Design a protein around this ligand. Structure first.
Ligand SMILES: O=C(Nc1cccc(-c2nn[nH]n2)c1)c1cc(C(F)(F)F)cc2[nH]cnc12
Ligand SMILES: O=C(Nc1cccc(-c2nn[nH]n2)c1)c1cc(C(F)(F)F)cc2[nH]cnc12
Length: 263
């Protein structure tokens, strides 16, 4: 079947010229709303959630792991380093690196998380351990954002990412204090006001992680606490045919508004 919500998301997509993927989980009832829910999309920096969560899982058996210093050398800086560049020739703790990756989208910080996990495959291994058979991380920053159409590297599906985000933030994939820490980090994101949250009523609380890449790829994944409702999890992924395409956070906002209006 095709629902009224799906039909509106298709109209949005058609007007945008790109390819839109949406997955909602309403924890009011566990119901799901999907649009291209089983198609693959480049995750870009939305993958930083899985990396940070994998480090939080490691921390469950090492009380001091999040306090552990990691050297930042000049050669570690990549293409977007707002926090890490201030610590070159110094150190950042794994907590600081997690916060920087999630809340500022720092790519050097993400690479330190990936390295703590033994490389991209360590992030994938964590995904598998928490029941996500779809996610794959294949490369480090910045090349994981090439977002080439048809390339399976560094992709997931909306369905899989929504399920995983639910399990991490609302379920029991992490221990209690780790789940709370992940939620605190997502709620304190600096980069999200133009994306999913811009499509939702202002009284709703959002924690999210954005991403973007080549092919005008523009993404957001969010855990949402609506006014008067149980929490929602919402993934919005968007990618375009042209390598040089402009980002389109407004399309993500529009998708979120359709979803909200359909509840
Ligand atoms: O920093 C960003 N993009 C970036 C960084 C490094 C390099 C390149 C790049 N490399 N080749 N072309 N562009 C692009 C960024 C972009 C976006 C947007 F609008 F969605 F596109 C939102 C953001 N919020 C926080 N940071 C961002
Ligand atoms: O790294 C990149 N973008 C970036 C960096 C940091 C943060 C964010 C971001 N966070 N939340 N939204 N966007 C995005 C990027 C990289 C590359 C490449 F070639 F693969 F290396 C091409 C790009 N075209 C547009 N952006 C990129």
């Amino acid at each position: 079947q095709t629902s009224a919500v799906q039909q509106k998301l298709a109209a949005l997509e058609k007007s945008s010229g790109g390819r839109l993927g949406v997955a909602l989980i309403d924890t009011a009832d566990n119901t799901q709303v999907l649009y291209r829910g089983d198609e693959r999309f480049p995750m870009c920096s939305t993958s930083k959630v899985m990396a940070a969560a994998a480090v939080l899982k490691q921390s469950e058996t090492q009380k001091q792991l999040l306090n552990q210093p990691v050297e930042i050398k000049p050669a570690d800086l990549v293409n977007y380093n707002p926090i890490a560049e201030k610590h070159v020739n110094g150190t950042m703790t794994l907590a600081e690196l997690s916060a920087a990756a999630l809340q500022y989208s720092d790519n050097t910080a993400m690479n330190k998380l990936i390295a703590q996990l033994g490389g991209p495959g360590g992030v994938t291994a964590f995904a598998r351990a928490i029941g996500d058979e779809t996610f794959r991380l294949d490369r480090t920053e910045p090349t994981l954002n090439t977002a080439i159409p048809g390339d399976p590297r560094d992709t997931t599906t909306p369905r899989a990412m929504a399920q995983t985000l639910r399990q991490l933030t609302l379920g029991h994939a992490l221990g209690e204090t780790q789940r709370a820490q992940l939620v605190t980090w997502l709620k304190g994101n600096t980069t999200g006001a133009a994306s999913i949250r811009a499509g939702l009523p202002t009284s709703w609380t959002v924690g999210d992680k954005t991403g973007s890449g080549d092919y005008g790829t523009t993404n957001d994944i969010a855990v949402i606490w609506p006014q008067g409702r149980a929490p929602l999890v919402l993934v919005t992924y968007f990618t375009q045919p042209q390598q040089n395409a402009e980002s389109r956070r407004d399309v993500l906002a529009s998708a979120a508004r359709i979803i909200a209006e359909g509840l």
